[PDB]
Design an enzyme around this catalytic site. Structure first.
Site, mmCIF file in Angstrom:
data_model
loop_
_atom_site.group_PDB
_atom_site.id
_atom_site.type_symbol
_atom_site.label_atom_id
_atom_site.label_comp_id
_atom_site.label_asym_id
_atom_site.label_seq_id
_atom_site.Cartn_x
_atom_site.Cartn_y
_atom_site.Cartn_z
ATOM 1 N N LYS A 16 44.650 42.796 37.835
ATOM 2 C CA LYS A 16 45.311 41.524 38.038
ATOM 3 C C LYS A 16 46.713 41.487 37.541
ATOM 4 O O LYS A 16 47.621 41.075 38.259
ATOM 5 N N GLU A 54 44.666 33.384 29.958
ATOM 6 C CA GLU A 54 45.025 34.774 29.942
ATOM 7 C C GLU A 54 45.286 35.152 28.530
ATOM 8 O O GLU A 54 45.733 34.337 27.730
ATOM 9 N N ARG A 55 45.125 36.462 28.250
ATOM 10 C CA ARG A 55 45.233 37.039 26.939
ATOM 11 C C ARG A 55 46.652 36.927 26.469
ATOM 12 O O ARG A 55 47.585 37.084 27.252
#
Lengths: 51, 469, 187, 499
Positions: B157, B183-184
Site C-alpha cells: 500500500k 496508518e502507522r
C-alpha cells in the site's frame, strides 16, 4: 553454597509459615476473639471520629 | 446555555449522557466533557430517549467517573479551514499535531455535510497519466478520478501510494490533500520528512499539500471521523477556493473497520461477517462527497487493505461500487516478483474504452489481455504436465506471455532504494509502442531476464547487451 | 429529579409514582397508604399472598383490583391508578417490589439514611449506641439526614465489625485483618 | 534474619482507612461479576475484591458496574464486597525490573522478593506522535547471517517474526538476545538494549527451561522476563503484553535503547477472543472479535524510535506470530502483517529439511530495515539478496539441462545457502559475519567444495584472527570497508582459500 543457603532460608520461612497458621488457630480459640472486638470497636470509634 | 448532563454509561467509547436539562441536543451534535486531559469530544449519534442520548466518543476513554458534567458544544464538530491549512498536519479535532501552532482560519466548517446533488455534478473525461506502465496499459487514470487499490499491506500500500505522490503530485500544481486514516506513525513520519524535503511542504514558504493524519493507535471512534475531517478540508478547496485539488486516502479499510467496531457497541445488530448494517449508508456519503462537480475536480485515491485477502468480503464489495478505475493489487503477482503487484486481469478503468485511448492503444491492450488470459488458462496444463506438452502454437503464445509478464515490472523511483534499482518513469506514448512491438514479437528473441524488472523496450535491448557481456 | 436513581426493578414505576405524586406533594401520604394496602395484602395470606401468584386474567385481575380498593378507601388516587397500571401491565409480583422501591425513594426524600454494622454475632447495645452516636456525629451522616443503623448478624465475618454507609465502609473485622496478615507473612 | 524480615513485614501492617469502597457481587461466573454500587468509579479502574483478587472495571452502566475478574473465579462468589483500589490499572515500572522474572501482577516469580521500581505507569498509554519519532539509524544485530544481511533489522521498528509453531520458534529471538550480550554488556549505553522477553501462553516448565538457558548464558542481568503462562488466566493474558510494554516504555522514556519481543501475540488473540466471547460481544472473522485489530494495533505502535527531543529512545518490537498451518491469508496473521514493518517468515519446510535457521527469503521483507544497516554490512552484503533471488529463480527452473551461466549460479547458490545456516542456540559475532559474507560475495566460496563449507567457515575465521585480527579490529571500529580494507580482505580471503 550460596544457592543452598537461600534454600534453607526459604525452608525456614515455610516452616515459620505453618507456625503462623498454628498461631492463628490458637488466637481464634481465645475469648480474646471476643475481647478484641471491643478493641476494634473503640478503635473504630476513634478512627471514624477522626474522619 | 451549556446542556448539562451526567454520564449515565460508559460502555466502551460509546459513552451515554443523560441531559438533566430538558434541552436535548440533536443528532450529530458535539459535546465537550471537561477532563484532566483538557476536553473529551463526544458526538451524539442516537437519542435513546428519556433525555438520555448515546454518544460516540471521539477521543480516548478511561478515567471517566460515571456521572460527570457535560456541556453541549452543539452541531457537527467544526474544523478550521483556510489556505493556511496548507502546511499543517491536523488531528480529527483539528489540533496542529505538527505543532506549527494555531491554524489561521476564516471559516470553520462542520465535519458532516450533505453530498452534492445529482444536478450539480460535472462529469470529467480527462486522462491522467501516471507514467507507471502497467497503470497506463491496463487502467488509464482520469483527472478528477476516483482511483482504488486493494492493498498489499503497506509493503504494497505505502509503496504504491508513494509512487503516486511522486508522480501525480509533481504533475499537479493545485491543492492536494493527504489523509491518512489509521496508518502507522512511522509511515507518516517518513512521509512528513519526505514532503518537507521535496518542498511539497515548504516551511519557509507555504506548501501545496495539506495533511490530515490519524494513527492506527487512535481509538476506533476517533478513526471513524478522521475521514470526514479530510472530506471537509477537501470541500473547502473544492468549493471555497474553487480550484482543482488532489486527495489521497489510505487506509479506508480502517474507516470501514472502525465503523464495524462502533456499531456493535452502539447496539446495532451486526450484519454478516461482522460489518455494520450501516455499511452502505456510510460508504455512500463518503464516496459522494469526493465527486467532481462544476465547483471543482478532485482527483481522489482510495486504498483498501483487502480483509484477509478476500475480495469477496462485503467491505471490498462495496468499494467496487464507487471507483472510477480500480487496480487490484495481489500478493501472488508480488510473489511473481513483479512490482507493481497489480493483477493484470483484474484492473479496469472507465477510460479503458477503446475510443478514449484510441483504437491502437485499445487493440494493444486487447491483445495483452487475451494473451495473458490464455497464459493463465494454460497455467493449469503447464503445471500439471510441462510446458513442452503444450501445442506448438500455444507454446509460442505462452513464451510470448512469459515475456509480457516479465516486461510489466518497472523499477519505481520512490522505492528505488527498496527495489535496489534506480527508478523509471516511462511515457504513455512509449508504453503503447513498446507493447505493440512485443506483441508482434519484434524484440522476442532476447532473454526473459532482460525484460524482467527494467523499464522501457530500449532498456530491454540495452540490458540484453549487458547480459551478452 | 427524584432522589436516587433506582429504575429497572419496576423502579421506573416507583420513579413515575414519586414524581407524579411529588408535584401533588402526597408522597408521604401515598407511601403511608401504599404501606397500609401492602400490609393488609401481606396480612391477607390465603390466596391474597398466594394469589399474588400470577395466573389471573386481565379482567379477573381487574376484579381483584376492585376488591383491593374495596378493602379500604384511603388511597392517593395516583396509587389507585398505579393498581390499574400493574393490572394492565400484568404484574402484581412486582407490587411489593414497587412498594419497597417507593419506600426507598420516599425515605430518600425524607432524607433518612440507612447504614449497617455487620458483625460476627450481635454485640452490646451500648456498643450499638456508641457507634450510632459516633456515626451521627461524624460527617458520614449528613446534616439533617437521619441514619437508621442496622446491626446485622453474619457469622461469615469472623469476628470484628464492618461499618457501612454512604458507600464508604471500614471493614476492620478479624477475618480481614487475619487475611492481610497471612498474605504479608507469606511474602 | 528470616525472623527479622517477617517482623518488619508484620510491623508494616498498620490500620485500614475509610473511603469509598464496597460494591456487592451479584451475578458472577463467566469471569465477570456484576456489582451493585461503586457509584463513583474511574473508568478502567483496578478494583480489589475481598475475595482477595483484583479485576478491571469494564462496563460502567446505569446502576451496575461489571468488573472483569483479572484472576480466578474460584475464590470470587456472590454477595462479596468489592473494594475500589481507586486507581486505573498501573504496573510498577523502573530500572530494578532488570534481571527479575515477574508475572503479570508484577509479583516476583523469580521470588527474589520485592522488585525495585521507580514508578508505576498506566497499562494503556498512547503511542508517541509524528513529531516524536526519528527515523532509524542504529541496527540491531542478531548475530545470525541473513537475519542481519538479507533481513536488515534496526532499532524502534516493529519487525514481525512470523512462522509456524515450535519450529524452535523461541530460538530465533533467543539468539538475538544472546548476540546483543556483547553490546549490552558493553559500557556504551547507546549500545545498550535492555531487552524484554514476554512469554505468554507457554508452559511454565518451558519458561523455566528458557529462564535456565538465559541464566546459563548469564543473560538474565540485562533482560526482564514477564510471564503469563498457558495455565495463567485469560484476562491476565490479555493485559500481559500491554503491561510489558509499559515497562519497556520506561527505558524508552529514559531515552535509552531497548527491545521487546512479544512471544506470542497469536496467543493474545485467542485470549482476547475468549474474553470477548465471555463478554458476549459479537465475534468477527475466524471468531476473533472485531476489535482484535484495535488490540494489536494499539499494542504495536507503542514501539518506536523516538526523536532527539525524547532523547532518541528505542523500543524495538519483535512480535512472534504462530501460523496455524502457514496460513498466510489467515485473519490474525494478515492483520498483524499490515501493522508491522516487514515480515520475517521462516520457511518451515526448509526447517524440517535441515536448514536451521530457515528464513523464507521471499516472504521476508523489512520496510525500512536497510538504512539501519552499517556500511560494512551494506557494501559486503551488496546484492546478495538479488543473487540468492537469482538462486531462487535458478532452482525454480532447474527442475533439466543447465547452461554454464545457470550452473555457475546454482553452484554458488547452493553453497551460499549452506553458508547461511547456523547452529541453533549459538550465534556468531557481528564482526565475524562481515568476512563470511565478504568471502561468498567476492566469489571466494565459489570454488570451495560443498562438503567443506562448514570447515571453511571456522578455519577462515581462525585464519583471519591468527593472520591479522588487525583487519577485523579495523572493520570493528571503522564499520565501513575502506578500499584498502577491501583489497586487503580480498588478498587475505584468497590467502585463506589457498589453505
Amino acid at each position: 553454597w550460596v544457592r543452598y543457603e537461600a534454600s534453607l532460608r526459604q525452608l525456614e520461612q515455610r516452616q515459620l509459615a505453618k507456625s503462623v497458621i498454628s498461631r492463628v488457630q490458637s488466637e481464634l480459640g481465645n475469648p480474646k476473639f471476643q475481647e478484641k472486638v471491643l478493641q476494634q470497636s473503640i478503635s473504630e470509634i476513634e478512627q471514624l471520629l477522626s474522619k | 446555555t451549556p446542556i448539562t448532563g451526567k454520564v449515565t454509561a460508559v460502555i466502551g467509547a460509546i459513552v451515554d449522557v443523560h441531559f438533566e436539562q430538558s434541552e436535548l441536543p440533536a443528532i450529530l451534535n458535539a459535546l465537550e466533557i471537561k477532563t484532566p486531559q483538557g476536553k473529551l469530544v463526544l458526538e451524539v449519534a442516537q437519542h435513546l430517549g428519556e433525555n438520555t442520548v448515546r454518544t460516540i466518543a471521539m477521543d480516548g476513554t478511561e478515567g471517566l467517573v460515571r456521572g460527570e458534567k457535560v456541556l453541549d458544544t452543539g452541531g457537527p464538530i467544526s474544523v478550521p479551514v483556510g489556505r493556511e491549512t496548507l502546511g499543517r498536519i491536523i488531528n480529527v479535532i483539528g489540533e496542529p499535531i505538527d505543532e506549527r501552532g494555531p491554524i489561521k482560519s476564516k471559516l470553520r466548517k462542520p465535519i458532516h455535510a450533505d453530498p452534492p446533488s445529482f444536478a450539480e455534478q460535472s462529469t470529467s473525461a480527462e486522462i491522467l497519466e501516471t507514467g507507471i506502465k502497467v497503470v497506463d496499459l491496463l487502467a488509464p487514470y482520469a483527472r478528477g478520478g476516483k482511483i482504488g487499490l486493494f492493498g498489499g499491506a503497506g509493503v504494497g500500500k505505502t509503496v504504491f501510494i508513494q509512487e503516486l505522490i511522486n508522480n501525480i503530485a509533481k504533475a499537479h500544481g493545485g491543492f492536494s490533500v493527504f489523509t491518512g486514516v489509521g496508518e502507522r506513525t512511522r509511515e507518516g513520519n517518513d512521509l512528513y520528512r519526505e514532503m518537507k524535503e521535496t518542498g511539497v511542504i515548504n516551511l519557509e514558504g507555504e506548501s501545496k499539500v495539506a495533511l490530515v493524519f490519524g494513527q492506527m493507535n487512535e481509538p476506533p471512534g476517533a478513526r471513524a471521523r478522521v475521514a470526514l475531517t479530510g472530506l471537509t478540508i477537501a470541500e473547502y478547496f473544492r468549493d471555497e477556493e474553487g480550484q482543482d485539488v488532489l486527495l489521497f486516502i489510505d487506509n479506508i479499510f480502517r474507516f470501514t473497520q472502525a465503523g464495524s467496531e462502533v456499531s456493535a457497541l452502539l447496539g446495532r445488530i451486526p450484519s454478516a461477517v461482522g460489518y455494520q448494517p450501516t455499511l452502505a449508508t456510510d460508504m455512500g456519503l463518503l464516496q459522494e462527497r469526493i465527486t467532481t462537480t462544476k465547483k471543482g475536480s478532485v482527483t481522489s485515491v482510495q486504498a483498501v487493505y483487502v480483509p484477509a485477502d478476500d475480495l469477496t468480503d462485503p467491505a471490498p464489495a462495496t468499494t467496487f461500487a464507487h471507483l472510477d478505475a480500480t487496480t487490484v493489487l495481489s500478493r501472488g503477482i508480488s510473489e511473481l516478483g513483479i512490482y507493481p503487484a497489480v493483477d493484470p486481469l483484474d484492473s479496469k478503468s472507465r477510460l479503458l474504452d477503446a475510443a478514449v485511448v484510441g483504437q491502437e492503444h485499445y487493440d494493444v491492450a486487447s491483445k495483452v489481455q487475451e494473451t495473458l488470459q490464455t497464459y493463465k488458462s494454460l497455467q493449469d496444463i503447464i503445471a500439471i504436465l510441462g510446458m513442452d506438452e503444450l501445442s506448438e502454437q500455444d507454446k509460442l503464445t505462452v513464451e510470448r506471455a512469459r515475456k509480457i509478464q516479465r516486461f510489466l515490472s518497472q523499477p519505481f523511483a520512490v522505492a528505488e532504494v527498496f527495489t535496489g534499482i534506480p527508478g523509471k518513469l516511462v511515457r504513455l506514448k512509449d508504453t503503447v509502442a513498446s507493447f505493440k512491438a512485443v506483441l508482434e514479437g519484434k524484440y522476442d528473441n532476447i532473454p526473459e531476464h532482460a525484460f524482467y524488472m527494467v523499464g522501457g523496450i530500449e532498456d530491454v535491448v540495452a540490458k540484453a547487451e549487458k547480459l551478452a557481456a | 429529579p427524584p432522589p436516587v436513581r433506582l429504575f429497572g426493578v419496576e423502579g421506573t414505576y416507583a420513579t413515575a409514582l414519586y414524581q407524579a405524586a411529588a408535584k401533588n406533594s402526597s408522597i408521604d401520604a401515598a407511601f403511608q397508604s401504599l404501606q397500609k394496602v401492602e400490609s393488609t395484602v401481606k396480612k391477607n395470606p390465603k390466596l391474597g399472598h398466594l394469589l399474588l401468584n400470577p395466573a389471573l386474567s386481565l379482567k379477573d385481575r381487574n376484579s381483584v383490583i376492585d376488591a383491593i380498593v374495596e378493602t379500604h378507601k384511603n388511597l392517593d388516587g395516583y396509587v389507585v391508578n398505579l393498581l390499574k397500571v400493574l393490572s394492565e401491565n400484568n404484574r402484581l409480583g412486582c407490587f411489593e417490589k414497587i412498594a419497597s422501591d417507593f419506600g426507598v425513594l420516599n425515605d430518600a426524600h425524607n432524607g433518612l439514611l440507612k447504614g449497617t454494622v455487620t458483625s460476627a454475632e450481635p454485640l452490646d447495645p451500648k456498643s450499638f449506641k456508641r457507634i450510632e452516636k459516633a456515626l451521627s456525629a461524624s460527617k458520614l451522616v449528613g446534616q439533617g439526614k437521619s441514619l437508621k443503623l442496622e446491626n446485622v448478624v453474619k457469622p461469615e465475618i469472623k469476628g470484628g465489625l464492618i461499618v457501612e454507609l454512604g458507600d464508604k465502609t471500614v471493614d476492620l473485622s478479624i477475618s480481614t485483618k487475619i487475611q492481610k496478615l497471612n498474605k504479608v507473612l507469606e511474602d | 534474619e528470616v525472623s527479622s524480615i517477617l517482623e518488619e513485614r508484620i510491623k508494616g501492617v498498620s490500620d485500614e482507612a475509610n473511603l469509598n469502597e464496597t460494591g456487592r457481587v451479584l451475578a458472577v461466573g463467566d469471569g465477570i461479576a456484576r456489582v451493585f454500587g461503586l457509584n463513583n468509579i474511574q473508568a478502567e479502574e483496578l478494583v480489589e475484591f475481598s475475595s482477595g483478587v483484583k479485576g478491571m472495571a469494564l462496563n460502567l452502566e446505569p446502576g451496575q458496574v461489571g468488573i472483569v475478574l483479572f484472576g480466578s473465579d474460584r475464590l470470587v462468589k456472590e454477595g462479596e464486597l468489592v473494594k475500589r483500589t481507586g486507581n486505573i490499572v498501573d504496573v510498577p515500572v523502573g530500572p530494578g525490573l532488570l534481571g527479575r522474572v515477574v508475572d503479570a501482577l508484577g509479583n516476583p516469580i523469580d521470588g527474589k522478593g520485592p522488585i525495585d521500581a521507580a514508578g508505576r505507569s498506566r497499562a494503556q498509554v498512547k503511542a508517541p506522535g509524528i513529531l516524536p519519532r526519528r527515523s532509524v539509524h542504529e541496527p540491531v544485530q542478531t548475530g545470525l547471517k541473513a537475519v542481519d544481511a538479507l533481513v536488515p533489522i534496526g532499532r524502534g521498528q516493529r519487525e514481525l517474526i512470523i512462522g509456524d509453531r515450535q519450529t524452535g520458534k523461541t530460538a530465533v529471538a533467543l539468539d538475538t538476545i544472546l548476540n546483543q550480550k556483547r553490546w549490552n554488556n558493553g559500557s556504551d549505553e547507546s549500545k545498550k538494549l535492555y531487552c524484554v522477553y514476554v512469554a505468554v501462553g507457554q508452559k511454565r516448565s518451558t519458561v523455566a527451561q528458557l529462564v535456565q538457558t538465559l541464566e546459563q548464558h548469564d543473560a538474565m542481568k540485562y533482560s526482564i522476563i514477564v510471564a503469563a503462562t498457558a495455565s495463567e488466566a485469560a484476562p491476565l493474558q490479555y493485559l500481559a503484553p500491554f503491561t510489558a510494554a509499559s515497562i519497556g516504555e520506561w527505558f524508552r522514556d529514559n531515552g535509552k535503547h531497548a527491545l521487546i519481543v512479544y512471544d506470542d501475540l497469536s496467543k493474545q488473540a485467542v485470549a482476547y477472543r475468549q474474553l470477548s466471547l465471555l463478554l458476549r460481544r459479537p465475534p468477527g472473522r475466524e471468531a476473533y472479535p472485531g476489535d482484535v485489530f484495535y488490540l494489536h494495533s494499539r499494542l504495536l505502535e507503542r514501539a518506536a524510535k523516538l526523536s532527539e527531543k525524547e532523547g532518541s529512545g528505542s523500543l524495538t518490537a519483535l512480535p512472534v506470530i504462530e501460523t496455524q498451518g502457514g496460513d498466510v491469508s489467515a485473519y490474525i496473521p494478515t492483520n498483524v502483517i499490515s501493522i508491522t514493518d516487514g515480515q520475517i517468515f521462516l520457511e518451515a519446510e526448509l526447517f524440517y529439511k535441515g536448514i536451521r535457521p530457515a528464513i523464507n527469503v521471499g516472504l521476508s521483507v523489512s520496510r525500512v530495515g536497510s538504512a539501519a544497516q552499517v556500511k560494512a554490512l551494506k557494501q559486503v552484503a551488496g546484492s546478495l539478496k538479488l543473487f540468492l533471488a537469482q538462486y531462487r529463480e535458478v532452482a525454480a527452473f532447474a527442475q533439466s539441462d543447465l547452461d554454464a551461466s545457470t550452473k555457475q549460479t546454482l553452484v554458488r547458490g547452493e553453497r551460499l545457502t549452506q553458508l547461511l545456516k547456523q547452529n541453533q542456540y549459538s550465534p556468531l559475532a557481528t564482526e565475524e559475519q562481515v568476512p563470511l559474507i565478504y568471502a561468498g560475495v567476492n566469489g571466494h566460496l565459489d570454488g570451495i567444495e560443498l562438503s567443506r563449507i562448514g570447515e571453511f567457515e571456522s578455519s577462515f575465521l581462525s585464519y583471519l584472527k591468527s593472520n591479522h585480527n588487525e583487519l577485523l579490529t579495523e572493520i570493528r571500529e571503522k564499520g565501513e570497508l575502506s578500499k584498502e580494507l577491501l583489497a586487503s580482505l580480498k588478498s587475505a580471503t584468497e590467502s585463506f582459500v589457498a589453505t
